[PDB]
Design a protein around this nucleic acid. Structure first.
Lengths: 206, 204
DNA sequence: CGCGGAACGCGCACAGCG
DNA sequence: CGCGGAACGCGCACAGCG
């Protein structure tokens, strides 16, 4: 009912920690262990998980493959999302080649407008003009990796929204404007850099 | 409240960007309501985000704000950067043409024999074993882009070398001494955040 | 007229159950 | 015995003033 987004980010962290624990053969963990690895209090963990259910065992703890399964469900990773990359520049090309996507995310789109790229056969696929967006997105692409130069970002967004996209992972440094019907998440490395600058200059604060 | 919420610093970064665009458009005067509009926040928050540092208001001269903001964020100096992990991302970052005058790449490290010794925009790749010799006095921030499984270790090495801040791109929670700052850029996390958001539209 | 404190909404102790 | 509600604390109202 409450469900702060700060909690969704932490759930991501717990699932990753669970995958890792599983990889090490651990069968059972606890909020205390989980907190120690996610660098938060055990309270924060139990409270974050409580927003969705009671997956543990009182007096005992949490069975790793169970909670793991439960978090993947909540996070909507128990499905196979359709992805497309708009802006086959350098970052987008690195992305196309990222091997750590896993079962939950599948690349189906590849786009851009530059003639010198359009038509290049990328990893399992081929680039194409962003004009084919209206005829590519519906029912096959839900999420788009927006990676274009800061000035083409807002333009590319409109296009994507019109083509029926449901989510935009924005890599461009700028606040996008989209219908509130479309979810957007920013991945801003320059903002992070700037934050590091500030953090350094203000050690006390940090 | 003399203690600045960190969320306010994300907004200042956004304000600065909005100013640069203005200046670039030729505008000379802006307002609380104008900034908010462009930043999608209330004019209140803008004023509040600014009050933590001063009264730059008359008011609000784009160039006087752009300048005070970059001073507040520490962009008024030339930070030294290095990249640890020269794979696809490390390479992409190495050739990024938009750091600006505030961030300078002075190092590129790795362990792959095929990569070290390799020339790059701004220098050459060197083995991480050389960080203790390359960091002090020249490099404050490190762009960490190694595989997930080697992140912590690379981080342990940067710490040992005396690094001030790590911009972590690996999907892991780095463990570092308190005097070392860490900022994460997690796109897999954004992806999974979007996944959740799509399924919980009323939650929005 | 137009544009730099304080209230308010939201993010630990014990009850519950194995 | 061992490990899933409510207090606390962080993030609008008006005064000044051209």
């Amino acid at each position: 009912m409450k469900v702060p987004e700060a909690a969704i980010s932490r759930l991501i962290t717990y699932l990753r920690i669970l995958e890792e624990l599983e990889a090490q053969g651990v069968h059972r963990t606890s909020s205390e262990q989980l907190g120690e690895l996610a660098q938060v209090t055990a309270f924060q963990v139990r409270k974050d998980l409580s927003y969705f259910g009671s997956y543990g065992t009182r007096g005992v703890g949490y069975t790793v493959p169970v909670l793991k399964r439960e978090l993947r469900h909540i996070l909507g990773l128990n499905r196979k999302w359709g992805l497309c990359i708009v802006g086959m520049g350098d970052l987008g090309s690195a992305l196309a080649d990222y091997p750590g996507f896993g079962e939950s995310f599948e690349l189906r789109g590849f786009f851009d407008v530059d003639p010198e790229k359009v038509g290049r056969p990328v990893r399992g696929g081929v680039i194409e003009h962003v004009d084919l967006l209206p005829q590519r997105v519906p029912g096959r692409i839900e999420i788009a990796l927006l990676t274009v130069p800061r000035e083409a970002a807002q333009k590319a967004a409109d296009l994507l929204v019109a083509a029926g996209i449901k989510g935009i992972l924005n890599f461009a440094p700028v606040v996008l404007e989209v219908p509130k019907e479309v979810a957007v998440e920013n991945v801003d490395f320059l903002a992070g850099l700037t934050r590091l600058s500030f953090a350094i200059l203000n050690p006390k604060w940090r």
